[PDB]
Ligand binder design. Sequence first.
Ligand SMILES: [Mg+2]
Ligand SMILES: [Mg+2]
Ligand SMILES: [Mg+2]
Ligand SMILES: [Mg+2]
Ligand SMILES: [Mg+2]
Ligand SMILES: [Mg+2]
Lengths: 182, 239, 47
Amino acid sequence: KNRLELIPENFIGEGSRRCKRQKELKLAVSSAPFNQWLSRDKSDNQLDDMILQATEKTLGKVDQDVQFSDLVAKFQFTKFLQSKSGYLIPDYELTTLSTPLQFKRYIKEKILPSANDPKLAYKEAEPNAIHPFSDNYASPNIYVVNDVTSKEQKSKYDTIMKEIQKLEDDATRKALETARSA
Amino acid sequence: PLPNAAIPPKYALVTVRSFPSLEPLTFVPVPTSTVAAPLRRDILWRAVVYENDNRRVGASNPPGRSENGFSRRKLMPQKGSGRARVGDANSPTRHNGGRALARTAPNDYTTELPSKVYSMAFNNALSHQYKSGKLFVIGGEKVDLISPTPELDLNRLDLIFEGEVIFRKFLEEFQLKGKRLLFITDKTREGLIKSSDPYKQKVDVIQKELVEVNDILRAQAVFIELEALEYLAMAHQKE
Amino acid sequence: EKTSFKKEWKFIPGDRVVVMSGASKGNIAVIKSFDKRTNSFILDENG
RNA sequence: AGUAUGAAAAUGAUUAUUUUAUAAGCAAUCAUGAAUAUAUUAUAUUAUAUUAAUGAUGUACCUUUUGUAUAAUGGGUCAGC
RNA sequence: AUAAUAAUAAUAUGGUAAUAGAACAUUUAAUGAUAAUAUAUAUUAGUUAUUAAUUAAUAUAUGUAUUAAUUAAAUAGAGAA
Ligand SMILES: [Mg+2]
Ligand SMILES: [Mg+2]
Ligand SMILES: [Mg+2]
Ligand SMILES: [Mg+2]
Ligand SMILES: [Mg+2]
Ligand SMILES: [Mg+2]
């Protein structure tokens, strides 16, 4: 003789087939057999030693500024570099660059900046994108207003409000309890 | 003499991989003409447009004053009415009538392109893709491998059904969830297609012989068999 | 007449039922009768 | 001749601002007082907007013509085609 | 030895029939971020040598562009029957 409320504890059935499937898929994704030869991503200090390590692995004690001996060796070097780094290099780049030092330089130029600053990264949808800061304009009068998405800000605000609610409400509850006690 | 008269580089290295993950096995040297051609966008444009034209259905069929339903009766006498002159009620001048210069049944929008030009365009597309670094070649049986092909993963470009899960995992790994991709395959890898069909909207799976320039250009990342690639090269050679 | 079903219903007048997604969502009610044309049920005093 | 929606116009009534009962003609443009309205920099000796004081200038538009204000052709207005 | 912009000097810039060159609006297809602090349409006042677009305020939608741009095309622009 009451309204039960629709909480999943009261439900008993083998339905929600489209949700169950999704859940299963998620589970599978979480634990699946896969090579994954690039787990952690490469800081510039790391890069500095990484190249050396690669050289040691491959060709032994040879100058980094000097060219590769053979193609197989080069391939070996490059693969190793990729694996240690986390970021795979475009085949064109591989074809072009003919020395470990050169490779390192390329890496520094290209993949390092996006690793440190995440919003400075390359989104394909806008290839002609530009990312200016107030520092770039060498003058006090010029400044760049921060691009914080009007969604993110909103979310933050909401979170703050929630936190406040949790706090003040909790305090009130505590007070009430105290009153009840004495 | 003519100074600065160098000889051009004739080859370019494309790293062969293994398609569930993508672990580099070998370098293969492919000719410069099919993978490092300078970007001639106008040639590309010629191809793409041509392709589009050929793809048209062309079913614009409004009724002309001939095909429109009315009778041929002259609605009003020539004179005596004090009104404007009228013929049959099919004139495009009147709201219910036919359309002037109507387009009729199957409209043919097909155009021609020299085969050589088309081939060049194809090559150019491939080159562009390679330059982008969004060309990925998969293969093994045909060439000597430097690193040995790993276990639990093959070189066939093939895979609830488990395959789908694997595909999903691969996508997750390679940061190419939302973006469109193109699998150029040597034969009908049915399993692969089955795996991919959940992500059908963003996934093209194409048989070798039927790959289009548009399809390559459209695709944000292309995955091709080594054999298929070779075949393509042979097709759009030069001679 | 073709679209209406005839059992082929998921419920029968008499049995007890929970109603959700309405103004009285989470309600409990006895289903008193059905309207065939509309393929719908009428619920005791509630719903 | 589907269902929603509808500050689209032509068209009607009404109210407000303004001009108008010694003034004559494509009803506009330019000059130029005055009155009203709005304006979170009207600081004002302010700025915009509206409005047929008053002055000057000003033969509708198309078509066809050697040539049209023509009293030559065509159009009641608006919307859609 | 180019392009874009800005100078200096010069010459040229009425136009029917007609020829030539360059743009914009609308709609569809290919590619395509983004977001209710956004967008679309409308009204009013601004702005840019201005058939266009943009800014601000206002009103109505809509969990949101076939959106910017480049192509391809057109049932692609109406006071004149
Ligand atoms: Mg005259
Ligand atoms: Mg008349
Ligand atoms: Mg002229
Ligand atoms: Mg038309
Ligand atoms: Mg009209
Ligand atoms: Mg006009």
